[PDB]
PDB file of C-alpha atoms and ligand atoms in Angstrom:
ATOM      1  CA  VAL J   1      69.331 261.612 294.118  1.00  0.00           C
ATOM      2  CA  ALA J   2      69.241 258.136 295.800  1.00  0.00           C
ATOM      3  CA  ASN J   3      66.744 255.982 293.758  1.00  0.00           C
ATOM      4  CA  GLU J   4      69.554 254.262 291.701  1.00  0.00           C
ATOM      5  CA  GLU J   5      71.525 251.037 292.588  1.00  0.00           C
ATOM      6  CA  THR J   6      75.018 252.003 291.185  1.00  0.00           C
ATOM      7  CA  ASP J   7      77.318 255.091 290.744  1.00  0.00           C
ATOM      8  CA  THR J   8      80.777 256.144 289.332  1.00  0.00           C
ATOM      9  CA  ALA J   9      83.885 254.921 291.269  1.00  0.00           C
ATOM     10  CA  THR J  10      87.729 254.487 291.013  1.00  0.00           C
ATOM     11  CA  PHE J  11      89.953 251.427 291.753  1.00  0.00           C
ATOM     12  CA  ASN J  12      93.785 251.045 291.444  1.00  0.00           C
ATOM     13  CA  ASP J  13      96.959 249.397 292.982  1.00  0.00           C
ATOM     14  CA  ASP J  14      98.884 252.730 293.341  1.00  0.00           C
ATOM     15  CA  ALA J  15      98.017 256.443 294.164  1.00  0.00           C
ATOM     16  CA  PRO J  16      94.795 257.169 292.160  1.00  0.00           C
ATOM     17  CA  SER J  17      94.300 260.432 290.211  1.00  0.00           C
ATOM     18  CA  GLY J  18      90.562 260.381 291.234  1.00  0.00           C
ATOM     19  CA  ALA J  19      90.608 258.334 294.477  1.00  0.00           C
ATOM     20  CA  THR J  20      87.335 257.338 296.136  1.00  0.00           C
ATOM     21  CA  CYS J  21      85.916 256.457 299.599  1.00  0.00           C
ATOM     22  CA  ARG J  22      85.760 252.883 301.084  1.00  0.00           C
ATOM     23  CA  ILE J  23      82.172 253.510 302.393  1.00  0.00           C
ATOM     24  CA  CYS J  24      80.398 255.444 299.580  1.00  0.00           C
ATOM     25  CA  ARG J  25      82.854 255.518 296.572  1.00  0.00           C
ATOM     26  CA  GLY J  26      82.633 259.356 296.271  1.00  0.00           C
ATOM     27  CA  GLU J  27      85.645 261.198 294.737  1.00  0.00           C
ATOM     28  CA  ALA J  28      87.389 263.869 296.857  1.00  0.00           C
ATOM     29  CA  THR J  29      85.820 267.342 297.046  1.00  0.00           C
ATOM     30  CA  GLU J  30      86.656 270.988 297.824  1.00  0.00           C
ATOM     31  CA  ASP J  31      85.114 270.782 301.342  1.00  0.00           C
ATOM     32  CA  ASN J  32      85.280 267.038 302.129  1.00  0.00           C
ATOM     33  CA  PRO J  33      88.290 265.433 300.339  1.00  0.00           C
ATOM     34  CA  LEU J  34      89.665 261.900 301.028  1.00  0.00           C
ATOM     35  CA  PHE J  35      92.549 260.551 303.183  1.00  0.00           C
ATOM     36  CA  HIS J  36      93.658 257.191 304.669  1.00  0.00           C
ATOM     37  CA  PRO J  37      93.199 257.021 308.537  1.00  0.00           C
ATOM     38  CA  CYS J  38      94.579 253.464 308.484  1.00  0.00           C
ATOM     39  CA  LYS J  39      96.786 250.876 306.641  1.00  0.00           C
ATOM     40  CA  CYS J  40      94.008 248.747 305.077  1.00  0.00           C
ATOM     41  CA  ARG J  41      95.767 249.645 301.735  1.00  0.00           C
ATOM     42  CA  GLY J  42      94.580 249.544 298.064  1.00  0.00           C
ATOM     43  CA  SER J  43      91.249 251.250 297.078  1.00  0.00           C
ATOM     44  CA  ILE J  44      89.493 250.713 300.520  1.00  0.00           C
ATOM     45  CA  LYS J  45      91.874 252.896 302.601  1.00  0.00           C
ATOM     46  CA  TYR J  46      90.436 256.258 301.477  1.00  0.00           C
ATOM     47  CA  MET J  47      87.437 257.894 303.170  1.00  0.00           C
ATOM     48  CA  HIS J  48      85.548 261.199 303.483  1.00  0.00           C
ATOM     49  CA  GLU J  49      85.923 263.049 306.855  1.00  0.00           C
ATOM     50  CA  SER J  50      82.145 262.560 307.347  1.00  0.00           C
ATOM     51  CA  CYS J  51      82.197 258.836 306.343  1.00  0.00           C
ATOM     52  CA  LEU J  52      85.000 258.142 308.896  1.00  0.00           C
ATOM     53  CA  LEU J  53      83.109 260.001 311.662  1.00  0.00           C
ATOM     54  CA  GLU J  54      80.044 257.726 310.975  1.00  0.00           C
ATOM     55  CA  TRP J  55      82.164 254.535 310.637  1.00  0.00           C
ATOM     56  CA  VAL J  56      83.938 254.784 314.036  1.00  0.00           C
ATOM     57  CA  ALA J  57      80.459 255.612 315.383  1.00  0.00           C
ATOM     58  CA  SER J  58      78.987 252.275 314.076  1.00  0.00           C
ATOM     59  CA  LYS J  59      81.953 250.527 315.858  1.00  0.00           C
ATOM     60  CA  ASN J  60      80.345 251.596 319.219  1.00  0.00           C
ATOM     61  CA  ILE J  61      83.303 253.788 320.385  1.00  0.00           C
ATOM     62  CA  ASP J  62      83.404 257.349 321.842  1.00  0.00           C
ATOM     63  CA  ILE J  63      86.174 259.157 319.858  1.00  0.00           C
ATOM     64  CA  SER J  64      85.818 262.138 322.279  1.00  0.00           C
ATOM     65  CA  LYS J  65      87.146 260.113 325.334  1.00  0.00           C
ATOM     66  CA  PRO J  66      90.693 259.088 326.549  1.00  0.00           C
ATOM     67  CA  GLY J  67      89.263 255.653 327.570  1.00  0.00           C
ATOM     68  CA  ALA J  68      89.181 254.232 323.992  1.00  0.00           C
ATOM     69  CA  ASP J  69      91.476 252.614 321.337  1.00  0.00           C
ATOM     70  CA  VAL J  70      89.333 253.426 318.203  1.00  0.00           C
ATOM     71  CA  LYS J  71      90.660 251.319 315.341  1.00  0.00           C
ATOM     72  CA  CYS J  72      90.245 248.942 312.402  1.00  0.00           C
ATOM     73  CA  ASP J  73      89.496 245.178 311.993  1.00  0.00           C
ATOM     74  CA  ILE J  74      90.828 244.634 308.407  1.00  0.00           C
ATOM     75  CA  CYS J  75      94.449 245.680 309.075  1.00  0.00           C
ATOM     76  CA  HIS J  76      93.883 246.624 312.808  1.00  0.00           C
ATOM     77  CA  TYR J  77      95.729 250.010 312.497  1.00  0.00           C
ATOM     78  CA  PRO J  78      94.779 252.893 314.872  1.00  0.00           C
ATOM     79  CA  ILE J  79      92.358 255.168 313.031  1.00  0.00           C
ATOM     80  CA  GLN J  80      93.429 258.807 312.499  1.00  0.00           C
ATOM     81  CA  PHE J  81      91.105 261.856 312.118  1.00  0.00           C
ATOM     82  CA  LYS J  82      93.418 264.650 313.437  1.00  0.00           C
ATOM     83  CA  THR J  83      97.161 265.655 313.257  1.00  0.00           C
TER      84      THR J  83
HETATM   85 ZN1   ZN O 101      82.250 258.314 301.675  1.00  0.00          ZN
HETATM   86 ZN1   ZN O 102      92.643 249.415 308.568  1.00  0.00          ZN
END
């Protein structure tokens, strides 16, 4: 379903009980949760694993190469998608 112009979301100034993405305000799942790859902080730090993979792609950077420095512009922290 994608005909609407709004959807349910969560916003707070501490660790949310139902945290949501910074790209599509979805709430963590059982296959694609949420996590903060960066130090943007607040309610726009979280992101789905998919959403991050599409974000760093829009930034015009090859995350599969050792010739990159894939990171933010809000807080400028190096983005993290593995540990
Ligand atoms: Zn998302
Ligand atoms: Zn950031």
